[PDB]
Structures are given as structure tokens and as C-alpha cells.
Amino acid sequence: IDPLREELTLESLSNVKANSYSEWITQPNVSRTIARELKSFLLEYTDETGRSVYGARIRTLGEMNSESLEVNYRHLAESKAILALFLAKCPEEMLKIFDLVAMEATELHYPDYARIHSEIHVRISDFPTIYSLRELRESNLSSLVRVTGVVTRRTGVFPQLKYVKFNCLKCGSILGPFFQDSNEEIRISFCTNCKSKGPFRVNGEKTVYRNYQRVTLQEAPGTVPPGRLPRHREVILLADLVDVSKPGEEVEVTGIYKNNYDGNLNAKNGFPVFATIIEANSIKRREGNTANEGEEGLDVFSWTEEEEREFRKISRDRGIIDKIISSMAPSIYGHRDIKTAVACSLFGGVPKNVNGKHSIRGDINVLLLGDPGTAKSQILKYVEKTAHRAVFATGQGASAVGLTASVRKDPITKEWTLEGGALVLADKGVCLIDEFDKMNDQDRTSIHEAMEQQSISISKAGIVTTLQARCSIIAAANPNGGRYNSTLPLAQNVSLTEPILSRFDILCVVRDLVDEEADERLATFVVDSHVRSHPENNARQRRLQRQRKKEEEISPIPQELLMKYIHYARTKIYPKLHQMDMDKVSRVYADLRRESISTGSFPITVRHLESILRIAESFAKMRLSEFVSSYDLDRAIKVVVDSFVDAQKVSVRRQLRRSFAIYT
């Protein structure tokens, strides 16, 4: 038997006989044992359900033509503790072996996958320990670390030489290709054959290129101590990792802590100090996901095939829309009109492009004009948590170019450049503007183009460009005087102008009135919620079970399942209108215009007919239906008419409600 082909066992693998972990892993027999154990873990691991998680993951990976297999660290730790320890201590060689064993499990399912992607990368999802850029020390060198920060700066994607080939200047012999480290340059000093002190011209008949990118990771403002300067690190993103993190975002970086010799560093400091970097292994978008940190996986909004089947099963239910509405902010007692609007905005409409000449917005904007203590900021926070991409801004905390896009001079290239804003960051998402009425006029006026054209136009310092802002806006405002005056028209209760008001699809007026029954019910619900949330009131499985039991009381649908459902519906569902009552909608629009002719009333234009259609599309989308039904159109008509009626005065509200009773 060839000794190089013999293998040890797991308990013998635990016992280390080398001077270092890397030397132990690199040994032939140990490497074979590790590869065999990793393959066994990938093939045989089962979850609580009992199905192979990684088999389905590999199937999905092959279906989408991707080159990254996500492996949860906890699964490996429970299944194989020693392998998890090796991965934590020696990420490099362990990751190499893991990558090899993954293209043999992918190839197991798709035999000819090598013709699509040559190699497959393994990405670690949930490293148990999280560090700050301040906490990094020398003891973390050459070991896997998990850090969080802000992407301050970014480079363009460059092709980097995977393998470097050298040829002697003198002799002319061409040395074999050598592995290019991501961190620092590879050079040949001593020639095997020539033995020449002289340098080698670097030449190669054929070279394989690799995607390369570098970012400047900075401590997030939230985590840095107040009033202290942030610390930063340089993160290197290799192939398949490029462009995943965009400047200004908050991310969690899983990578290898590496050091290298820097001459200028030494020169400047006067001590033998080594530069440090991070080799990114995995990136998780933490932006707007502070309250979602309790979940697992690189993306909490992604779904599996079984979850898709569950989504279909849920959608087939008749009362899906009612459950979805009831599940919006379960801790808020009532306001079933502010929950319906929020759900409609979250799901959104279908943008349309007629013959390539006419562009129609497909997003829904909502405005909350109400009393001081009617749970508006909490609703905005919930929307931020649930939405896939959300941005939160305050009244005076937002500038006219902090929203939209701004122009700066690039520190490196000394040239004018373009930066994104709130709107940009909220592309295909939601922008939340609390304290809308306290906004500066200038600031307010900025969003006019963005809210309808879904685009940002910039003409500054020789920069002539148009961006994409396909973001919905939900805003909370306080009526003039600090309290709504139901006697006066809507226009006199707020300082907003006709265009901005017209740009809002749904208006939700919130009134605080003293009523014995309403006060009793609201107080009872608030007290019950406060008692429910008291901190005092397997171990992980037990915690999840008790959390699920607590959630079941107030929400018919799990919150995480709800977020996944919303993301799936937005991504994969585009309803269309083919059968609909033209006369009904036309008459509703005409009646709305006739009733809105009154001075000081809520503005009505074609925008609101389009908003009726958009809300019908959104209601159809809530059921994962490919076609808008008559019921959805009726519901949208009822919503719009109810909002319009509620926006009126006390004196004429009864007459308006009696007149419009047919549609509602």
C-alpha cells in the first residue's frame, strides 16, 4: 500500500503531532482525512426537517450558475468540532480543501459543471465571535475574523493575474507559473537553473485573470465611542465578491487577518511595524438591518425551495390579504388604515413602459399626518425593519443633496465625482422621512423629481448625468399648530403645497379623541404588550420556540416569513390588468374630481387614477397572482375613496360619505 494514500481517523486527526496547525493540515494523509470528512459533512448533514441542507444548496447553486457555496459555521461546529477549530485557526489551507471538496459535491450533482465555472468558493456565514476594528490585535493574525464597518471608499474592478510566469533576462529560460498572493507581490531571486542574480522579465504565453477590488472599511458611527475618531482597515475582495458592497453601506466582513512588510510604514513610524489587511471571505449587508441581527445566513431576505412552496401554500389561502394587513406592526393596537397603506407601499406596483416612449411610476407613496402620540415613528421603524432596502431620515437632519446625489472632489484623482444619497441607497426600496413638516423648503423640494420621474438629474461642475431612484417614500408629519383641526379643510391644517400633496398616493389622517371604550381597549393592549416584552418574561431551539409562542399571540404570520414573502412577491411577481370595469373607475375618478373642485380640498389629478391602478396591482401582488382581479380593484377603489372622504371636513363629511356609499 502506498503510504501517501493511507488515511487516519477522526480521533487520531484530533491529536496533533506537528509544530503548527498549518504543518499538520498540509501533510498528505491529514489533508486526505480532512477532505474526506468535509465531503461526508456536506453529503450527510441533516437539519431538523431531515433533508440534506447542502444538497439543496448545491442544486440551487448549479441552477443559478453561481460559484459560491454558503456553509453555516454552526452546522460544521456541531457536526465536526475539530474541523471547525482548524478552520478558525488556519483559514487558508482549510478553505482551499473546502473549496476542492465542494466542486466534487457540485460535480456529483452536475457532472459537467466544470465547463461553467472552473472553481467553487466556500463562504462562512455566521462566525460566532464578532470583533470591532479597535479590538483587533496581533493574536488575531492569520486567523478568521468577523468585523463590521462602513464602506467609505471603493476602487474599480481590475483583472489580477492568477498565475505569474517568469523568464530569465540572460539565460532566456522561462520559469513555471507561480501562485499570486492577493496581499503582496511574488518575486524570484534565485534561479533554479541559471543561478543568476539578475532580475527576470515577467512574460507568459497564457495567463488566467481574476477579478480584484479593494475597499476602505471604517468603524460604523453607531459602534464607535461617542466623540472618538474611527478606526479603519483595508478589505480585499477577490473574484465573485466584487461590487457586492457599495460605498456608504454597513456590512459585516468575514475574512483572514493578514500582515505584510511595508517599507514606508517602517520609515514613517521608525519601528518595525507591519501593515495589516483583511481578505474578504463573505459579506453581509447590515445596512438598515439592525433589528434583523437575530437571524442566520448571509442574506436574511433570501429563500429556499421549500420556503417558496410554503409561500405558494400561504398565498393560495382566501384570506391572505387580511392576514398580511393584520401582521403589519402587530404591537400597534389599531390604525387598520395606516397598516393597509403601509402594506400596499411595501408591496408596491408594477412599473410600465408603453412602447418605449411613455414611462409610468410603479411605486406607492404614503403620508401620515396625525396627532403627536398616534404611533407614527414606530410604524416607520417597522417599515424600515421589514423593507429589503430602507433608509431613515429626520426632518432637519436631511439636506437637499444628502437626499438625491451630491458632487465632491475625489481625494486621490483630484477630479469632480458623484455620490449617492438617501434616495439612491433606497433604490427599489423605501425612504422614510420622519418629521416631514419640519423640513426646510429647499430640502423638501429636492424629492419632487425623484418621487414621480423615479430619476435624479445632476448638472454640476461639468457632470451631466441622470441616475435611477426607484424608491417609495413614506413620511410622517404633524399638522400645523401641533394638532389636527377637523373643522378646517385639509389644506389649512398643513403647510405643504399642491404638487407635493398630489405626489402622495395615500393620505392617512390620524386623530386623537377621548373615548371611554377606545381608551380602555388601547390601554389594555399597551399594557399587555409591555408585559409581553419584559426581558425576564436545545437552548437555541428552546429560545426560538418561546419566541415563536410569544409572536403567535399578536401576528398570524411569522415576521421573518413575512419579510421573505414580501421580497419574493416583489422580485418574482408582475401582475397585469386584462379584465376590469372601465366605467366604474372612470365614474369614480369623475366623482372624485367633482367633489375635489372645492377650495382647500385634497388635490386630485390623473396621478390618483394611476394610484388606484397601482394599489389594485399591489393588492393582486399580495396574493402572488399573475392577474389583477375585480376584488382587488374594488378594494383599491374603497381605500382611495375612504381616504378622500376622511380628508374632508366635519360639516360635509356626512354628505360625502352618503354620496360615495356605492363604491365603499
Binding site: 442544486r59 448549479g62 450558475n65 452536475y110
Partner: protein, 300 residues
């Protein structure tokens, strides 16, 4: 496959009646299955969507072997067939099926009683475009016909998706029924040939499969410019490429006799002027009584 040599491989598999029937490409599951099949064949998605001429030559040469080893897994073993391919010096090669598809597309979309006469005059005019396409000097007409065929197949696929998602195909014991009333492309289906194309698409999909007893299908469309129907009876088809004694025997189209008998007995001003006796024109109001009598006749 639909126009393999003048479109992409992905489009060829996507817009084929047989592939859609055997995979149900009208929903997300079918698309996922097709993507999985393409991934196991070793063809990248970007490569598959590349046009036929510029597709990587290695994959094009290996296509025969790749199909030989992978199509059986997904039940598409019938895609393998022998056809006639004609080539001219330094020109592209076109198969007989693609030529027929181009000719039919030119015939279909090439470009009260008065409107009917004008429509039939337009069809007579399209006949001459189809005739001209048969010449070797007029190749631009053939390319235009190929493009129109692609567009028409796309439209028919959309209409079929709409029909199947809405579950518009009512099932009666004697026969199936499907009526179009508020589609997006109702105008295209005034031509009998386009209606027959849609009927064949629907017959192969979810009916030839599913192990359901063969039943003749009724397909009807509506045009608002004249306020009348175009009813077309369609004979059932056995599973494709399944040699059997019962498959050897043919299935006759009995709808002409039943339609004639109903028209003679009833009073609805029906038109049986078309050469294909199974295709008739029915007034808007009379379709419900006509279908009642058809169900009660039992001669289908």
C-alpha cells in the same frame, strides 16, 4: 425545437410546444427545471442565450452527444429526429420545419360584411408574400417571415400562459371548452391559422400529457370590430412519438357534422363558408345556446 438555427438555444427550448408540454414552462417550476437541465448539460446560461451563429463552436459540435446523454433524464427523448436541411453556397442553412414556420408566419401576419371582405382580401394578399418567399432570390422576405414567426410564437405563448393561469379551460364530459373574451392580443386570432396555432399549443400542453382521456377541444375568440366569434373544433392527439396499435389508428374530426346539424336545426345565422368545416363564425349572443345544443347532441 422552435427555430433553432435562427434564434438562441434557450429560446428554442423555451418556445417549443413539446418542451413546454413536457416541462410546463408556463409557470416558475418549468423555468427552474429548464435552468437545471441546462446546468446539467454543461452549457452556461450566457452561452445558451447566445445566437446560433455566434455560439461557441465546441458546444455546437457536441450538442448531439450532449442531447444523447441528458434529454432522457427530463423526458425529452423525442426531441431527437431526422430532418431535411438545405444550404446555399456561403449562405446559412435552414431546415424544412423552419422554412414552413416562416411561410406560415408570412401567411398569418404578413403585410359588417365590408370589414369581413377587407380582412379576407388582406389574407389573399398575404398569400402572395408567402408565394414570393418560396423563391431563392427573395431571401429578405424569408428573414422577415422568420422574425414574424418569432413574434407570433411569443404572442401565442403569452396568450396560452394567460389561458392556463386563469383556468379558463372548462371541462365537460363530452368535450373541453375554452373561450377568449378580454385578452391582450385578441386581434391576432381573427385569422383561422393563428387560432389553430394556439389550439395546437394548448392541445399539446397539459392535455396530451397528464394521462387524461382524449377529448375534442373547442376554442373560441372574439373581435369587437365585428362582434362575432370564431369557433374552431380541434381533434385530440395521442402522445407524440408513441407507436401503438391504438396510436396507429387515426382520430377523425366529427365537429363538422355536429356543427352543420345544429346550424340547420337552430336559427343563429352561423357561417360555414370556410373550407375547414370545423371553423365557423358565431354571433355574440348565440354562442351559449349553440354550446348548450352541442353538449346535448352527443355526436362529437
Amino acid at each position: 425545437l422552435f427555430l433553432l438555427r435562427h434564434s438562441s438555444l434557450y429560446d428554442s427550448f423555451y418556445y417549443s410546444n413539446y418542451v413546454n408540454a413536457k416541462l410546463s414552462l408556463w409557470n416558475e417550476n418549468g423555468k427552474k427545471r429548464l435552468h437545471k437541465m441546462f446546468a446539467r448539460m454543461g452549457i452556461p446560461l450566457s452561452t445558451a442565450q447566445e445566437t446560433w451563429l455566434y455560439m461557441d463552436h465546441s458546444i455546437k459540435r457536441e450538442l448531439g452527444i450532449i442531447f444523447d446523454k441528458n434529454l432522457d433524464r427530463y423526458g425529452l427523448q423525442d426531441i431527437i429526429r431526422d430532418g431535411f436541411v438545405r444550404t446555399l453556397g456561403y449562405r446559412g442553412s435552414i431546415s424544412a420545419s423552419e422554412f414552413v414556420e416562416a411561410l406560415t408566419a408570412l401567411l398569418e401576419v404578413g403585410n359588417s360584411a365590408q370589414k369581413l371582405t377587407n380582412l379576407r382580401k388582406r389574407w389573399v394578399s398575404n398569400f402572395w408574400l408567402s408565394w414570393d418567399a418560396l423563391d431563392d432570390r427573395k431571401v429578405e422576405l424569408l428573414n422577415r417571415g422568420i422574425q414574424l414567426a418569432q413574434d407570433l410564437q411569443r404572442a401565442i405563448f403569452n396568450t396560452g400562459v394567460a389561458i392556463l393561469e386563469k383556468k379558463l379551460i372548462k371541462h365537460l364530459r363530452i368535450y373541453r371548452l375554452c373561450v377568449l373574451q378580454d385578452g391582450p392580443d385578441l386581434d391576432l386570432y381573427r385569422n383561422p391559422l393563428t387560432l389553430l396555432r394556439l389550439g395546437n399549443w394548448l392541445i399539446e400542453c397539459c392535455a396530451e400529457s397528464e394521462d387524461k382521456q382524449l377529448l375534442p377541444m373547442v376554442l373560441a375568440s372574439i373581435d369587437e370590430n365585428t362582434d362575432t366569434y370564431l369557433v374552431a373544433g380541434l381533434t385530440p392527439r395521442y402522445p407524440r412519438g408513441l407507436d401503438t396499435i391504438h396510436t396507429k389508428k387515426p382520430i377523425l374530426n366529427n365537429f363538422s357534422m355536429a356543427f352543420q346539424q345544429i346550424t340547420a336545426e337552430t336559427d343563429a345565422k352561423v357561417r360555414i363558408d370556410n373550407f375547414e368545416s370545423s371553423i365557423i363564425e358565431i354571433r355574440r349572443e348565440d354562442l351559449s345556446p349553440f354550446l348548450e345544443k352541442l353538449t346535448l347532441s352527443g355526436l362529437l
